[PDB]
Design a protein around this ligand. Structure first.
Ligand SMILES: Cc1cc2nc3c(=O)[nH]c(=O)nc-3n(C[C@H](O)[C@H](O)[C@H](O)COP(=O)(O)O)c2cc1C
Ligand SMILES: CCCCCCCCCCCCCCCCCC
Length: 354
C-alpha cells in the first residue's frame, strides 16, 4: 500500500528513458501550474524565465498551460505560443532551463467553454456543444461564463490546424516537446465527456466519435514534431467544470488503447488528489488508466515524495508530477534528495512568482 511509506525514496532519482529521443535524469516532474504572470502580449517574462530555471533539477518540467490562439484564453495573463514575440519569450525560458541542465515540455491549451470573451475582444466562446458552465472567472471582477457556440466541423479543422501550428512553434521556441492539455475540463476533455459533448455528428454520441477530436489533435501534432516529443494529459474522472456521467468510462476504454498505438512520450493524469476513488472508474484515476494503458504513465495529485516513491515501487505509475510543493519549495528536488524539511503549500503563495 502507498500509505505504508518507507525510509528511502531512492527510486525517484532513477534515470528514466522515455524513448529513443529523451532520457530524464530522475522521475520527478514539475506539474503544469498556471500562474497568470505573462505580460500584456501573453509573452513569458524574464521573471518567468528565472522561475522555471530554478526548477531545472526536475527530470522534466511541464510548463503552465499555454494558449494556442486568442479564443483559448480564460484567465488573465496566461502565456501563448502563437506569435513570434511569444516564441522568442519562450526561447528565453527553454534556453535557461537547458543551460541549467533541465528539460521542459510546453503544455498546449485551449479552454473551450471555459474561455471568456473579455480576453479576446468579445469573440465567440467555442465548445463541442452549447452547454454553459456555472459561474464566473475566478479572481476577476464579474466575468460570467457564457453559452458557447457549438463548433462546426470547419471550426474543428481550424482548431486541429492551430494545435499543430502551436506544436511547430514550440519546437522553434526550443522546447523538448509538448504535453497536450486533454484534461481538467478544457477543450479536448470537453469532447470526451457527455456533460459537455451533446453532439450528434461524427464528433459525438459514440466512444469512437467522442475520441475523434483528441486523436486528430494527437495525430496532427505527431505529424509535426514526432511521437517521442508528444505527451497527453487526460482526466477520465470528471471533477473541474465538468459534471459526471456514467457513460464516460467507455469513452476512455476506447481512447486509451488507441493512444497506446501512437507510442506517446507519456500519458499524464489530471487530478488534484489521486487518493480519491471514482465510482465510475472502479477506483482511483491512475489505477483506472494503468488497467487500460500499458506505456509510461505520469501520476499526480497530493503525493508526497514518500507516497509517490511507494506508488512507483508498486508499479502504479512510472513518473511523479509534483505541483503545489514545487510552488512552496523551488528547491523541492534538492530538499527531497537531502531529506530536508519541506514547506507546505498555501494558496497565498500564488501571489508571488518565486
Ligand atoms: C495554482 C495551480 C495551477 C494549475 N494549473 C494547471 C495547468 O496549467 N495545467 C494543468 O494541467 N493542471 C494545472 N494544475 C493542476 C496541477 O498540475 C496538479 O495536477 C495539481 O496541483 C495536483 O498536484 P499536487 O497535489 O502535486 O499539487 C494547477 C494546479 C494549481 C494548484
Ligand atoms: C486552476 C487551478 C487551481 C484550482 C484551485 C481550485 C481547485 C480546482 C480543483 C478542485 C479539486 C477538487 C475537485 C472537486 C470535485 C469532485 C470530484 C470527486
Amino acid at each position: 500500500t502507498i500509505e505504508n511509506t518507507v525510509n528511502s525514496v531512492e527510486n525517484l532519482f532513477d534515470t528514466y528513458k522515455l524513448n529513443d529521443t529523451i532520457t530524464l535524469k530522475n522521475r520527478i516532474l514539475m506539474a503544469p501550474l498556471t500562474r497568470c504572470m505573462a505580460d500584456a502580449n501573453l509573452v513569458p517574462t524574464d521573471d518567468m524565465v528565472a522561475y522555471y530555471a530554478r526548477r531545472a533539477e526536475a527530470g522534466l518540467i511541464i510548463s503552465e498551460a499555454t494558449i494556442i490562439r486568442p479564443d483559448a484564453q480564460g484567465y488573465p495573463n496566461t502565456p501563448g505560443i502563437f506569435t513570434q514575440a511569444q516564441i522568442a519569450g519562450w526561447r528565453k525560458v527553454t534556453d535557461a532551463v537547458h543551460a541549467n541542465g533541465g528539460k521542459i515540455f510546453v503544455q498546449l491549451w485551449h479552454t473551450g467553454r471555459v474561455a471568456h470573451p473579455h480576453f479576446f475582444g468579445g469573440g465567440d466562446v467555442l465548445a463541442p456543444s452549447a452547454q454553459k458552465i456555472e459561474g464566473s472567472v475566478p479572481r476577476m471582477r464579474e466575468l460570467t461564463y457564457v453559452t458557447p457556440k457549438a463548433v462546426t466541423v470547419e471550426d474543428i479543422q481550424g482548431l486541429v490546424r492551430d494545435y499543430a501550428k502551436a506544436a511547430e512553434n514550440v519546437i522553434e521556441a526550443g522546447f523538448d516537446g509538448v504535453e497536450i492539455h486533454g484534461a481538467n475540463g478544457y477543450l479536448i476533455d470537453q469532447f470526451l465527456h457527455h456533460d459537455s459533448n451533446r453532439r450528434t455528428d461524427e464528433y459525438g454520441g459514440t466512444p469512437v466519435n467522442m475520441s475523434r477530436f483528441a486523436l486528430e489533435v494527437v495525430d496532427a501534432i505527431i505529424a509535426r514534431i514526432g511521437h517521442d516529443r508528444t505527451g497527453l494529459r487526460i482526466s477520465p474522472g470528471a471533477y473541474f467544470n465538468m459534471a459526471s456521467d456514467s457513460r464516460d468510462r467507455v469513452v476512455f476504454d476506447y481512447l486509451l488503447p488507441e493512444l497506446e498505438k501512437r507510442d506517446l512520450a507519456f500519458v499524464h493524469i489530471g487530478i488534484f488528489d489521486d487518493s480519491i476513488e471514482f465510482d465510475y472508474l472502479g477506483g482511483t484515476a491512475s489505477s483506472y488508466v494503468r488497467a487500460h494503458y500499458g506505456k509510461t504513465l505520469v501520476g499526480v495529485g497530493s503525493y508526497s515524495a514518500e507516497t509517490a516513491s511507494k506508488a512507483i515501487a508498486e508499479d502504479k505509475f512510472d513518473l511523479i508530477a509534483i505541483g503545489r510543493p514545487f510552488i512552496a519549495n523551488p528547491d523541492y528536488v534538492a530538499k527531497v534528495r537531502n531529506s530536508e524539511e519541506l514547506v507546505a503549500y498555501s494558496d497565498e503563495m500564488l501571489a508571488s512568482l518565486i
